[PDB]
């Protein structure tokens, strides 16, 4: 899923187990792989698709589960976001009508379970545009999380920062889906 470096030092991750994550009790079941998320400094790119103010469905977090205009699945979060360029300039910017509809999720306990205060606008974060151009990196960040591909986004002061499609850690019995 698409992650943004908000403070300007690259994308970074944390992990949860027991409460707020993968259950790992040997008595109940077994030890299981810890659930990974973005730092309390950074965030994920999202869109609320039913207007309930929160992220709770598998299409609402941009990644290899979002659908294209014909209803085919996107191959990665960049292909999922590229659908929202209106004019064919290969950037997502305020002249695209979807720019007003995009949000960033900063989860304040990093459980990846959404509350309305955890969502933010692009304009309040000072964002000018997101780039659709990328390069593959396959970079391990920590606790099983891996950045697959990386590009940029731009802030209204004219400065650039990193974004990319981040593979998030989970146990293979639940895969942390937005049920
Ligand atoms: Ca950062
Ligand atoms: Ca929703
Ligand atoms: Ca555009
Ligand atoms: Ca939360």
Structural determination approach: NMR
**108 CA distance to ligand 4 centroid (A)?**
6
**Which ligand is closest in space to the CA of residue 128?**
3
Is the sign of the CA dihedral 119, 42, 90, 156 positive or negative?
positive
**140-144-148 Cα angle (round to 5):** 45
Distance CA 136, CA 8 (A): 20
Do residues 91 and 129 make contact, with C-beta atoms less than 8 angstroms apart? yes
Q: Ion ligand 1 — residues with CB under 5 Å?
A: 5, 7, 9, 41-42
As a three-state string, the secondary structure of the chain is CEEECCCCCCCCEEEEECCCCECCCCCCCCCCCCEEEECCCCEEEECCCCCCCCCCCCCCECCCCCECCCCCECCCHHHHHHCCCCCCCCEEECCCHHHHCCEEECCCCCCCCCCHHHEECCCCCCEEEEECCCEEEEEEEECCEEEEEEEEEEECCCCEEEEEEEECCCCCCCCCCCC
**163 CA distance to ligand 1 centroid (A)?**
10
Domain ranges of the chain: 1-179
């Amino acid at each position: 899923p698409l992650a943004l470096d908000l403070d300007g030092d690259g994308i970074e991750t944390v992990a949860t187990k027991g409460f707020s994550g993968s259950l790992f009790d040997h008595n109940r079941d077994g030890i299981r792989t810890a659930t990974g998320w973005v730092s309390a400094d950074d965030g994920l790119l999202v869109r609320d698709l039913n207007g309930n103010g929160i992220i709770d469905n598998g299409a609402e977090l941009f990644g290899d589960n979002t659908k294209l205009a014909d209803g085919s699945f996107a191959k990665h979060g960049y292909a999922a976001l590229a659908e929202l360029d209106s004019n064919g300039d290969n950037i997502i910017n305020a002249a695209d009508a979807a720019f007003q509809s995009l949000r960033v999720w900063q989860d304040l306990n990093q459980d990846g379970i959404s509350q309305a205060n955890e969502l933010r606008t692009l304009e309040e974060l000072g964002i000018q545009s997101l780039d659709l151009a990328y390069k593959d990196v396959n970079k391990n960040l920590g606790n099983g999380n891996t950045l697959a591909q990386q590009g940029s986004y731009t802030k209204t002061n004219g400065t650039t920062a990193k974004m990319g499609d981040l593979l998030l850690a989970a146990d293979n019995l639940h895969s942390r889906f937005l049920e």
